[PDB]
Amino acid sequence: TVSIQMAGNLWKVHVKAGDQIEKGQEVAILESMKMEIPIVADRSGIVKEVKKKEGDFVNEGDVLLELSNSTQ
Questions:
Q1: Which of 1, 19, 14, 16 minimizes the C-alpha distance to 62?
Q2: Beta-strand (E) ranges in the chain?
Q3: CATH 3.40.190.10 fits 1-72, yes or no
Q4: What is the DSSP letter of 6?
Q5: For a tag on the chain, would you pick the N or C end, based on fewer CB atoms within 10 A?
Q6: Measured distance CA(56)–CA(46) in Å, rounded
């Protein structure tokens, strides 16, 4: 999994299931603190699933996406 790390609203999301991410690649944007903050892949992988959408509420530790198992 990869998760949000602050309270806010998930401004936009750029992944989809079957997409590729790499550690530090942009994955979403979070709006909070009257600012916008990029959200990145904490690790590389294929996006197995996405758990959020644009404009949804999000929190510190709230899941953003899930990735391929190491066997893949």
A1: 1
A2: 2-3, 8-13, 20-21, 26-32, 35-40, 45-50, 57-58, 63-67
A3: no
A4: S
A5: C
A6: 23
